[PDB]
Amino acid sequence: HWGYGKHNGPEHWHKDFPIAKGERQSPVDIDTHTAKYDPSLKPLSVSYDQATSLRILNNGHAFNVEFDDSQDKAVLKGGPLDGTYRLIQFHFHWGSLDGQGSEHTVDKKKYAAELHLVHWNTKYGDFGKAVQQPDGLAVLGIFLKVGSAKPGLQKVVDVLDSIKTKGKSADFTNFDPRGLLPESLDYWTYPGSLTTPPLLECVTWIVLKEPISVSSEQVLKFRKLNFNGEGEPEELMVDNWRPAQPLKNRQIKASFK
Ligand SMILES: [Zn+2]
């Protein structure tokens, strides 16, 4: 029964998921004055040309756009990574107000939202095995600010009415996730965790420096989603973000000067 409310939000999660207090929890604040350039970090390779989106699902905490991950169709490689990571889904975290919503922060700045493109290491054969490994997942995180619309997000926005409530899904084929990327692939990277229960410490985080812009109308449509099921009391799906966690014995590395 975890969520983002007063009685079941992030400060409670540790009672069912004690790793919430672990050594490699996410998100974190990215201090741009202490992250160090690592000249040996390689450019990211984002290979999404053969991506096959399948479906969009409201899971009660966010919505996931799911992909066919049974072949190497949409993969992330390079950067800090060894091997090949397949895209399984993307989802977002967002706020009730434009001044909050991101999970990672940059010099304590919160963005309006944050996109997570979740990929699993093919050496582990399936997602469920990958999450049990320290190098199982690679998550590409992208900040959203409110400004101009993002044309490549509109197809997502327009389906949200069909998945208003928890457990609803809709067909969602032929969506191109390249339309969600900023111009630059400069990034920060560190080892961390899933940001929702089970909070497993299986993620190489790759957080892009450049945000994307979305319009006020686009974010407003995210805020009409519901945490609840159909025929349950309406609770708007907003503020579905975990705050920054202690960095502990980790270093954040930058791909750029
Ligand atoms: Zn996420």
Side-chain angles (χ1 to χ4, degrees), residues 7 27 33 51 62 70 102-103 105 107 117 135 159 177 194 222 228 233 236 238 253:
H7 309 289
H33 318 92
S70 73
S102 68
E103 296 207 306
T105 56
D107 298 325
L117 297 122
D135 62 345
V159 77
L194 298 176
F222 277 60
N228 55 280
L236 296 183
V238 294
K253 297 300 200 181

Side-chain angles (χ1 to χ4, degrees), residues 44-257:
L44 290 177
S45 173
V46 185
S47 293
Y48 288 170
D49 45 296
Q50 295 287 319
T52 295
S53 68
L54 296 171
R55 190 177 78 134
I56 192 174
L57 171 68
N58 180 333
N59 62 26
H61 34 109
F63 63 83
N64 293 168
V65 174
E66 299 165 353
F67 290 78
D68 177 8
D69 65 351
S70 73
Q71 288 186 97
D72 286 347
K73 286 181 167 189
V75 301
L76 185 63
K77 302 177 74 251
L81 306 170
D82 293 319
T84 298
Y85 290 69
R86 284 190 187 154
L87 180 64
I88 178 168
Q89 52 99 333
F90 67 79
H91 61 274
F92 302 81
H93 308 265
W94 63 92
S96 55
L97 303 164
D98 291 355
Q100 66 196 229
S102 68
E103 296 207 306
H104 294 89
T105 56
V106 180
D107 298 325
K108 305 294 181 75
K109 177 190 175 72
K110 294 173 170 90
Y111 287 86
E114 187 173 329
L115 168 60
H116 290 160
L117 297 122
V118 180
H119 311 74
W120 56 271
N121 192 328
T122 62
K123 77 187 285 172
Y124 301 122
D126 67 55
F127 179 83
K129 295 293 185 331
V131 297
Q132 299 176 65
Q133 317 306 146
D135 62 345
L137 290 187
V139 181
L140 185 57
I142 306 179
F143 296 118
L144 282 58
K145 61 184 180 181
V146 173
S148 302
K150 190 72 171 178
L153 182 61
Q154 190 64 30
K155 283 201 273 196
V156 172
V157 165
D158 278 339
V159 77
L160 299 181
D161 277 345
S162 82
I163 58 152
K164 183 177 176 181
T165 54
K166 182 176 179 180
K168 293 212 159 294
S169 67
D171 293 325
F172 204 68
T173 59
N174 310 100
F175 181 75
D176 187 349
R178 294 174 289 182
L180 299 177
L181 304 175
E183 177 187 325
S184 180
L185 295 179
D186 290 346
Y187 65 88
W188 299 278
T189 185
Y190 76 96
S193 73
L194 298 176
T195 72
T196 52
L199 300 170
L200 296 167
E201 296 177 339
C202 61
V203 179
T204 303
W205 278 95
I206 299 167
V207 178
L208 298 189
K209 166 201 88 181
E210 184 174 10
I212 63 168
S213 293
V214 304
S215 63
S216 51
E217 295 80 9
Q218 289 179 319
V219 187
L220 288 162
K221 289 183 185 184
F222 277 60
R223 301 183 182 141
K224 294 181 173 178
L225 288 163
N226 286 182
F227 285 130
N228 55 280
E230 187 180 13
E232 299 183 339
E234 186 166 21
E235 187 57 12
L236 296 183
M237 183 181 282
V238 294
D239 294 317
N240 58 351
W241 52 276
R242 188 187 192 193
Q245 301 301 306
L247 192 57
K248 301 186 178 179
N249 186 47
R250 292 178 293 178
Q251 292 183 319
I252 303 179
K253 297 300 200 181
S255 75
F256 63 94
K257 287 184 78 204

Side-chain angles (χ1 to χ4, degrees), residues 29-43:
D29 180 57
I30 302 164
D31 181 346
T32 66
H33 318 92
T34 59
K36 192 189 183 190
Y37 171 62
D38 183 348
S40 62
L41 286 167
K42 298 170 171 191

